[PDB]
C-alpha cells in the first residue's frame, strides 16, 4: 500500500551533435535479484539491487552504436547485447570468476537489430531486427537466419519453452513453434509494442499471450489465434507489460508517465510512481519460495527506467487489515483474499475476491467484505460447528471510507472528518460531522438500531455516538491525538493510547487519570473479570490487576485479545493463544482476605490443587459457602 523510493542514479551526460543519447531503453533483472542491468547510448551499466553503486565500471567501445535490449538467461550466466551496429553479442557471466563479464559469441544480421528474447528451458536466443530474424543454439554454434517482410519490434518465449510470439508495428502478431513455422497469424490495424506470456500456474496450467496494442487496449490470445474476447480498454497507450512470478500481478506503464499495478483479471490496485516522462521499461523482482516456506511476502520491488535518463527503484509494502470479534479471526491474505481462522483447531477458510479488499469487519455470525465499489455480507449457520457462508445481500453502491464497520441492520463508514450511517439497501441514512479526522472507532453492543459507539478525533476529544440520537455526547477530552481505545467489560474504565505510545486509564464515573504507562504498543481488557488489563510493548507483555505489581513474560508479539485464562499474541500475520497461571493473583487476594474476588479469580480455570488450597483457606477463616 505504501510505495517508497529506494535509490536513484541519474545519467546527465547528454551529448549534443551526436547520435548517442542519455536515454535508457531496457533494464534486465537477475532471477535471484542480486544484480541489475541497464543500457545507455554506447554503454552498459551494472548495479546492485539493494544499494545503488556500480559494482563494475561502465563498459565503452564494445559496440559502436546504441544498445537496444539487454536480457538475462533465467539462470544468471549469460548476456545478450543487440546494437544498431547490425550485431548481437553474447557474453558469459559469473560473479565469482575474476572476469565477471566477457564476450563469448558474436553474430550479425543484414540490418539493424531491434528486439531479442531467450528460451527459459533450452537457453536458445531469438533476435529479430529489420528485414531479418535469427535463431542461435549454444550447442551447434550455427545461427539460422531468415528474411521477413517488415521489422519485428517485440518477442517473448513461452514459459513452457515450446512457443514463440512476435509483434510488428504493421499490426501483425505471429505465433510460432521452436521450428519457426506459421502456427498462427493475427492481423490488426495498430502497431504492436509489448507482449508477454502468462506464467504457468497449478490453478490455471494454460498459457495465453497478453499483447498491448496502441489503440488503448490489451488483448488476450490463445495458442490457435482465437481471441478470448477480453479486449480490455485503457485510457493511455501501453508501452511495457510485465508479469510477476506465479502470475498474480501485472505491471503496466506507458503514457501519462505513470507506472500502475493491476490484477491478472484487470482490476486496478495502485500506481507506483509518476516520473514526469515516458517510462520505457519497468521490471519486477523475482522471488524464490522454499519447500513449505512460511512468509507473508508482502514486500515487492520494482525497477523503472525513464526517458530523461533516470533508473529508479521503488519498494511497495502492503499494510495489514484484520478483524477479531469472537472465536474467529478474519485477516486479509495476499491481496484479493480473505482468510478466516479459528483459534481452537487452527482450521482456515478462504474467500477469494477479484477486486482489492479495503476493510474487513465481522459482527455476530456476519462477515462484511469491502471491495472496490462493492459491499458483500456473509452469514453463518449457527447450529453446525463448522461455518457455512452464504451471500444474503450485495451492495452495488460506491462508498469510500478508511474505516468500515457493520452492526445489526446497519453499516458505519468513516470518511475524512465525517461518519455516515448506511442502510443495508444502500441509501444513506444519517450523517455526523466532527471538527477533525476520526482516527479510531469502537463498537459496543446493544439493541438493534440502537448500537452505541466510541469515537476518537485527531484533536483527542473522546465522543460517544448513538444511532438514533443524531447528537454526539462528549465523553471526555484528551490533549494528544488518539490511536486506539478500549472499554472494560462492565463499562467502568477506559484505556486510551496516544500517538506517542502512551497508555492512559480513565475512570468513567470520575474522570481521573488513575494509571499512566510509557512505551505501549497495544492493550486489551478481560471479558470475564472486567479488571485485568494486558498491555504489550514492543518486546514484553505485562498483565496488571487492581493495585497489584505487574507480571512479565518476555513473550514475543503484540496483544490483540484477552479471554478467560487466554491471551492472543499476534506476530507478523499469524497469531497464537497462551494460557496464564492465576495463582499469583489468587495468593495476593488471599493476603488481603478478599475471598469473594479470590474465588472469582479461581473460577477462571485454575488447577485443582489451588482449588483445594482455597477451600482450606476459606474453611479456616470461617467462610463456609466458598
Amino acid at each position: 500500500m505504501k510505495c517508497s523510493e529506494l535509490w536513484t542514479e541519474i545519467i546527465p551526460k547528454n551529448d549534443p551533435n551526436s547520435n548517442i543519447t542519455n536515454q535508457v531503453w531496457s533494464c534486465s533483472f537477475n532471477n535471484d535479484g542480486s544484480i541489475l542491468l541497464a543500457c545507455v547510448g554506447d554503454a552498459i551499466l551494472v548495479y546492485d539491487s539493494f544499494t545503488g553503486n556500480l559494482v563494475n565500471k561502465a563498459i565503452r567501445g564494445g559496440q559502436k552504436e546504441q544498445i537496444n535490449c539487454i536480457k538475462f538467461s533465467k539462470d544468471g550466466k549469460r548476456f545478450a547485447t543487440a546494437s544498431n551496429d547490425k550485431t548481437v553479442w553474447v557474453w558469459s557471466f559469473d560473479v565469482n570468476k575474476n572476469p565477471k563479464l566477457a564476450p563469448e559469441v558474436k553474430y550479425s544480421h543484414t540490418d539493424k537489430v531491434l528486439c531479442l528474447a531467450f528460451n527459459p528451458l533450452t537457453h536458445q536466443i531469438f533476435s529479430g531486427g529489420a528485414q531479418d530474424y535469427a535463431l542461435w543454439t549454444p550447442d551447434q554454434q550455427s545461427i539460422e537466419k531468415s528474411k521477413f517482410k517488415d521489422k519485428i519490434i517485440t518477442c517473448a518465449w513461452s514459459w513452457d519453452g515450446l512457443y514463440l510470439g512476435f509483434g510488428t508495428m504493421g499490426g501483425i502478431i505471429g505465433i510460432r513453434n521452436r521450428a519457426l513455422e506459421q502456427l498462427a497469424e493475427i492481423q490488426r490495424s495498430f502497431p504492436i509494442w509489448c507482449m508477454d506470456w502468462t506464467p504457468i500456474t497449478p490453478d490455471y496450467q494454460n498459457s495465453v499471450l497478453v499483447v498491448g496494442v496502441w489503440e488503448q487496449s490489451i488483448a488476450h490470445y490463445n495458442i490457435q489465434g482465437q481471441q478470448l474476447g477480453s479486449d480490455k480498454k485503457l485510457t493511455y497507450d501501453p508501452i511495457d507489460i510485465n508479469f510477476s512470478t506465479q502470475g498474480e500481478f501485472l505491471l503496466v506503464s506507458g503514457t501519462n508517465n505513470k507506472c500502475t499495478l493491476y490484477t491478472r483479471e484487470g482490476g486496478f490496485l495502485i500506481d507506483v510512481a509518476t516520473k514526469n516522462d515516458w517510462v520505457w521499461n519497468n521490471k519486477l523482482k523475482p522471488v524464490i519460495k522454499e519447500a513449505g516456506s512460511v512468509a507473508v511476502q508482502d514486500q515487492l520491488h520494482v525497477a523503472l527506467t525513464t526517458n530523461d535518463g533516470e533508473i529508479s527503484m521503488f519498494k511497495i509494502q502492503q499494510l495489514t487489515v484484520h478483524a477479531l470479534e469472537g472465536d474467529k479471526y478474519a485477516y486479509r491474505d495476499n491481496l484479493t483474499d480473505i482468510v478466516v481462522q479459528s483459534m481452537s483447531s487452527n482450521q482456515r477458510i478462504r474467500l477469494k475476491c477479484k477486486e482489492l479488499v479495503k476493510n474487513i469487519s465481522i459482527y455476530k455470525d456476519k462477515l462484511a467484505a469491502h471491495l472496490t465499489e462493492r459491499i458483500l455480507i456473509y452469514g453463518t449457520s449457527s447450529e453446525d460447528s463448522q461455518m457455512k457462508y452464504k451471500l444474503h445481500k450485495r451492495i452495488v453502491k460506491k462508498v469510500e471510507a478508511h474505516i468500515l464497520e457493520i452492526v445489526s441492520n446497519h453499516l458505519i463508514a468513516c470518511v475524512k472528518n465525517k461518519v455516515q450511517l448506511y442502510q443495508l439497501s444502500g441509501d444513506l441514512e444519517k450523517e455526523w460531522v466532527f471538527d477533525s479526522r476520526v482516527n479510531c472507532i469502537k463498537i459496543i453492543g446493544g439493541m438493534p438500531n440502537k448500537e452505541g459507539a466510541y469515537v476518537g478525533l485527531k484533536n483527542g476529544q473522546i465522543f460517544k455516538i448513538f444511532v438514533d440520537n443524531s447528537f454526539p455526547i462528549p465523553i471526555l477530552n484528551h490533549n494528544i491525538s488518539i490511536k486506539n481505545i478500549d472499554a472494560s467489560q462492565k463499562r467502568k474504565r477506559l484505556a486510551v493510547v496516544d500517538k506517542n505510545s502512551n497508555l492512559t486509564v480513565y475512570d468513567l464515573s470520575n474522570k481521573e487519570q488513575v494509571f499512566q504507562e510509557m512505551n505501549i504498543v497495544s492493550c486489551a481488557f478481560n471479558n470475564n473479570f472486567d479488571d485485568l488489563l494486558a498491555f504489550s510493548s514492543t518486546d514484553t507483555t505485562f498483565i496488571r490487576c487492581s493495585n497489584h505489581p505487574p507480571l512479565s513474560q518476555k513473550i514475543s508479539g503484540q496483544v490483540v485479545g484477552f479471554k478467560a485464562n487466554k491471551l492472543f499474541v499476534l506476530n507478523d500475520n499469524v497469531m497464537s493463544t497462551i494460557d496464564v497461571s492465576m495463582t499469583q493473583t489468587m495468593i495476593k487476594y488471599l493476603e488481603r482476605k478478599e475471598f469473594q474476588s479470590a474465588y472469582e479469580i479461581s473460577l477462571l480455570g485454575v488447577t485443582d490443587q489451588d482449588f483445594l488450597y482455597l477451600g482450606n483457606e476459606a474453611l479456616i477463616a470461617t467462610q463456609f459457602a466458598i
Partner: protein
C-alpha cells in the same frame, strides 16, 4: 524405523521368481515363474483379533496357477481400479485376465500378441484407463481399457523405459543408450532432460547422451507437477552409480544420492515418505543382495540384507505400506517394517498421535483421552519432534526461511504455553520432569520450565535477575562450564567438532550425552559440570536410564543390546547377550525390572532373568506397577468411521508376579496372603488387597491393609462406615466411595427410602441430577426451588 524378516513363501516348482506385483485395494500378490508359472494368492493378516491366532493362519487363500504360457514371464502388472491383470512373455504375447465370481477362477480376456517384436516395458495410467506398450523397434501403442487404439506411433530412437505423469497428460521415455525425453499424450516431442547426477563418468564434451544404461525411473503418483515448493517426487537411477531426485521435470537443481550398489529397482511408498532401492552390493567383499531405504530428501534410513548371497529383483509394497514383498531367486521374502510413528503418551491417559497428510508437508495431531473417549484435533504445518511428560507435551517444529526451530509446551487439551525459539538443529530431543534438552550435531541446549519443588517458572515477580527459568546452551568438545542466557542472534553455531553426538538421556538430577566414537559424558543438573567419562565400544542408538540412576541399557546401531553399570570413572558391562533388540525401557518404580521387545516379541526381565515371550504387534506406552500398556497405532490409522474404543486399541499386560498374587488371593485365605504380601510391601499390592477385603465386606483385613499403606483418609472412612446398622447402606456407600455413584443409586432404589439418594446427590454436588429426580417425584416446592436456584448459580458461574 526398523525392518526385519518374516514368513518365506517357498518355491512353486523350483523355478526362479523375477516379477512380483502386489495390489493396493485387496490383497492379491502375484509372482511369475520360469516355465510360464503365474501364481496369484492372498497373504496372511499381520494382526488378528486381540491375540495370537490358535491356527496361526497358515492358509493360502487362493494360490492358483494360471499357466497358459510356454515361455517365461517377466512383466506382471496389476490394475488397481479394476480386477484386470496384465502379463507378458518373451515372445511378445500380452495377456489380460479378469476376476469372475466363481471358485477362484481367472480366465483370459485379452489374448493380443505382436510377432517379430520384443516387448520391453508395459505401463498403465494412474487413472487406470490407458495402456502404453513399447518395443525395441520404437513403435509406441496406446490403448484404452475398452480396446480402442488411441494411437500407434513410430519413433526413430530405441526405447527402454516408460513412465507416466500423475495427471496422465504426458509421458517420459528412456533410451537404452541412456537419456530422458519428455513427450505429450499425443506423441509429440517436448524436450530432453539434462542429467547432473552422473559426474566424472559421462563424456566431458556432451552430457545429453552418455553410455550408461538406465536402471529405473520412477514418478510418485498423487504428486504436484506444476509447482516448485514441494518435496522431490521423481527419481532417476542408473545401472550402478548415482541416483538423482527432482521435485519437477523442469527442475535444474536435482538432489544427488550415491550408493555403492548395482541399482535394479526403485519403488516409492504408498504414502511417499520413503523409497526402496533393491539390488546387489559388493562392499562385503562378494555379491550380497540388499535393499536400501531412503527418505524423500535422502538419508539412507536403513539397509536390509537377505541371508542368501544372491540377487534381489522385484520389490512391492503393501496397500498400507507396512510390509514388503521381495522376489529373491526361488522365493518371495516378506519384510516387516515398523515406522517412526511420532507419538506421545501422558500420565493423564491422553495419547497424542501425529498423522502425515498426502501433501507430505502438513501434519495433524490427535489428542485422544483413553478414559472419557474424547477426541481433539490440531493442525501443525511442520513437525520435527514430539515428546511427553507426566502432564505436559513438547512439540518441536521448524520454521522455513528463518532457519529457526520453535519448541512449545501443550497441556492435555493442546493450548500452547511458553513457546520458545532456537537456532539449534534438533538432532536429538528429550524432556524430563523439570527440563527440556535438545542436542544438535555439536551443540547442547537445556531449558528449565519447572522450579525445584512444584510450580511453573513462567510467572515470577521477585528478583530483578533471572533466578528460575533460565536457558543454557554450550559446546560439546570444549567450554564444559555452562554459559549464561543465550539469544537467537547473539549465540554462534558455526564451530564444528570432530566427535559428534548421537543420543541424549535425562533424569531428575542426571544427564547423559553420547558420542559416536563411543564416549558418554555425565552432567549434574544444579550446576552443569562434567564428572565422569564412560567408554563404550560401539556407538549407542537408543539408550535408557534407570530410576535412581544405577544402571543403563545400551542398544547398538546393529541391534545388539547390553547393560552398562554406571560407576565413578569406570566401565562394567553385565553379560546379557539378547542380540537384535529393538525396544527397551526401564521401570520408573522398580529399580531393576525392565521390558524389552525384540522382533515383535516382548520380554520382561528382572535381575538378568528373562521370562517367556509374548507375541505383540503394538507399541509399548508405559511400564507402570507390574503393568505394561500397549497401543495398536496401525488400526488407529485405519479407523472406518471415526470411533475409537479403549476396549479395542489399548491392551494391558500384567507381570507374572501380579498374576501369581491375584491367583493366590482368589484361591488361598486372607492371613496367608497378608504374610505373603508383607515381604513385597508394595503400594499397588496393598491397594488391591484392601479392595478385595472391602469387596468381601471384611473390615479387619481392610483396616490392616490401610494402616500398612499409611493412609489416614481411608482410616477415617472406615471408622465412619463401621458405625452402621444395615447391610445395604454399607455396600452403597462403599460403591459411592470407590468411584461409582450409579451403583449406589441403584442399591438405594432397591432398598427404597429415596431421601438418602437425593441427599447424597445433593452432597456430591450434581445439581442437574437432583433436579431430574425431584421432578414429578414428590412435588416439594421448597426443595425444587432451592435446587433450581443452585442450578442457576452453577450455570451462571
Amino acid at each position: 524405523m526398523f525392518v526385519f524378516l518374516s514368513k518365506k513363501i517357498g518355491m512353486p516348482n523350483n523355478a526362479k521368481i523375477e516379477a512380483v506385483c502386489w495390489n493396493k485395494e485387496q490383497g492379491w500378490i502375484a509372482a511369475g515363474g520360469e516355465k510360464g508359472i503365474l501364481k496369484v494368492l492372498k497373504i496372511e493378516d499381520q494382526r488378528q483379533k486381540d491375540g495370537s491366532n490358535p491356527t496361526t493362519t497358515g492358509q493360502l487363500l487362493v494360490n492358483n496357477t494360471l499357466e497358459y504360457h510356454t515361455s517365461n514371464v517377466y512383466l506382471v502388472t496389476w490394475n488397481d481400479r479394476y480386477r484386470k491383470l496384465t502379463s507378458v512373455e518373451e515372445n511378445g504375447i500380452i495377456v489380460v485376465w479378469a476376476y469372475f465370481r466363481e471358485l477362484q477362477l481367472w480366465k483370459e480376456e485379452m489374448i493380443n500378441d505382436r510377432k517379430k517384436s520384443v516387448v520391453r516395458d508395459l505401463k498403465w495410467s494412474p487413472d487406470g484407463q490407458k495402456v502404453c506398450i513399447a518395443y525395441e523397434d520404437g513403435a509406441v501403442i496406446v490403448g484404452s481399457v475398452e480396446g480402442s487404439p488411441l494411437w500407434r506411433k513410430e519413433f526413430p530412437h530405441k526405447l527402454a523405459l516408460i513412465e507416466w505423469s500423475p495427471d496422465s497428460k504426458m509421458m517420459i521415455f528412456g533410451t537404452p543408450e541412456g537419456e530422458v525425453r519428455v513427450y505429450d499424450s499425443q506423441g509429440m516431442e517436448m524436450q530432453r532432460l539434462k542429467i547432473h547426477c552422473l559426474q566424472k563418468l559421462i563424456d566431458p564434451s556432451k552430457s545429453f547422451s552418455p553410455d550408461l544404461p538406465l536402471a529405473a525411473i520412477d514418478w510418485f503418483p498423487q504428486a504436484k507437477m506444476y509447482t516448485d515448493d514441494t518435496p522431490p517426487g521423481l527419481c532417476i537411477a542408473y545401472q550402478c552409480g548415482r541416483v538423482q531426485l527432482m521435485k519437477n521435470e523442469k527442475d535444474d537443481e536435482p538432489v544427488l544420492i550415491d550408493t555403492m550398489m548395482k541399482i535394479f529397482t526403485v519403488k516409492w511408498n504408498p504414502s511417499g515418505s520413503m523409497f526402496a532401492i533393491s539390488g546387489t552390493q559388493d562392499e562385503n567383499g562378494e555379491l550380497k543382495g540388499v535393499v536400501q531405504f531412503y527418505s524423500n530428501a535422502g538419508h539412507h534410513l536403513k539397509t536390509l540384507r537377505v541371508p542368501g548371497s544372491d540377487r534381489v529383483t522385484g520389490v512391492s509394497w503393501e496397500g498400507s505400506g507396512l510390509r514388503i514383498a521381495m522376489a529373491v531367486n526361488q522365493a518371495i521374502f516378506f519384510a516387516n517394517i515398523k515406522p517412526d510413528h511420532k507419538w506421545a503418551y501422558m500420565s493423564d491417559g491422553t495419547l497424542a498421535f501425529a498423522y502425515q497428510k498426502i501433501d507430505r508437508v502438513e501434519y495433524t495431531i490427535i489428542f485422544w483421552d483413553t478414559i472419557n473417549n474424547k477426541k481433539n484435533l490440531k493442525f501443525v504445518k511442520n513437525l520435527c519432534c514430539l515428546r511427553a511428560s507426566g502432564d505436559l507435551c513438547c512439540i518441536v517444529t521448524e520454521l522455513i526461511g528463518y532457519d529457526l526451530w520453535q519448541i512449545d509446551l501443550c497441556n492435555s487439551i493442546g493450548s500452547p504455553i511458553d513457546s520458545k525459539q532456537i537456532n539449534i538443529y534438533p538432532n536429538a530431543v528429550t524432556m524430563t520432569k523439570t527440563h527440556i534438552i535438545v542436542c544438535s550435531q555439536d551443540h547442547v541446549y537445556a531449558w528449565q520450565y519447572k522450579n525445584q519443588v512444584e510450580r511453573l517458572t513462567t510467572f515470577e515477580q521477585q528478583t530483578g535477575l533471572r533466578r528460575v527459568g533460565r536457558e543454557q546452551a554450550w559446546f560439546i568438545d570444549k567450554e564444559n562450564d555452562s554459559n549464561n542466557q543465550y539469544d537467537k542472534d547473539t549465540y554462534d553455531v558455526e564451530p564444528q567438532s570432530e566427535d559428534v553426538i548421537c543420543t541424549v538421556a535425562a533424569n531428575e538430577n542426571f544427564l547423559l550425552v553420547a558420542r559416536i566414537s563411543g564416549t558418554i559424558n555425565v552432567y549434574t543438573f544444579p550446576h552443569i559440570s562434567l564428572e565422569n567419562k564412560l567408554h563404550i565400544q560401539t556407538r549407542p542408538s537408543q539408550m535408557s536410564l534407570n530410576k535412581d540412576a544405577t544402571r543403563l541399557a545400551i542398544i547398538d546401531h546393529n541391534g545388539n543390546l547390553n547393560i552398562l553399570k554406571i560407576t565413578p570413572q569406570g566401565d562394567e558391562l553385565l553379560p546379557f547377550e539378547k542380540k537384535e533388540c529393538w525396544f527397551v525401557k526401564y521401570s520408573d518404580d522398580i529399580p531393576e525390572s525392565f521390558v524389552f521387545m525384540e522382533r515383535s516379541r516382548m520380554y520382561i526381565v528382572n535381575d538378568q532373568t528373562p521370562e517367556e515371550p509374548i507375541i505383540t504387534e503394538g507399541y509399548i506406552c508405559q511400564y507402570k506397577d507390574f503393568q505394561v500398556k500397549i497401543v495398536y497405532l496401525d488400526d488407529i490409522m485405519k479407523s472406518p468411521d471415526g470411533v475409537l474404543r479403549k476396549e479395542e486399541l489399548t491392551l494391558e499386560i500384567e507381570a507374572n508376579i501380579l498374576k501369581d498374587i491375584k491367583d493366590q488371593l482368589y484361591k488361598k485365605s486372607m492371613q496367608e496372603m497378608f504374610i505373603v504380601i508383607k515381604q513385597h510391601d508394595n503400594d499397588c499390592l496393598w491397594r488391591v488387597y484392601a479392595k478385595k477385603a472391602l469387596e468381601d465386606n471384611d473390615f479387619d483385613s481392610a483396616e490392616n491393609a490401610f494402616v500398612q499403606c499409611k493412609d489416614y483418609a481411608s482410616l477415617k472412612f472406615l471408622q465412619r462406615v463401621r458405625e452402621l446398622d444395615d447391610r445395604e447402606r454399607q455396600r452403597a456407600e462403599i460403591q459411592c466411595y470407590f468411584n461409582k455413584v450409579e451403583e449406589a443409586e441403584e442399591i438405594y432404589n432397591k432398598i427404597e427410602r429415596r431421601d438418602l439418594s437425593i441427599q447424597m446427590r445433593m452432597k456430591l454436588g450434581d445439581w442437574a441430577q437432583v433436579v431430574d429426580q425431584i421432578r414429578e417425584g414428590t412435588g416439594q416446592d421448597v426443595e425444587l426451588q432451592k435446587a433450581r436456584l443452585e442450578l442457576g448459580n452453577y450455570y451462571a458461574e
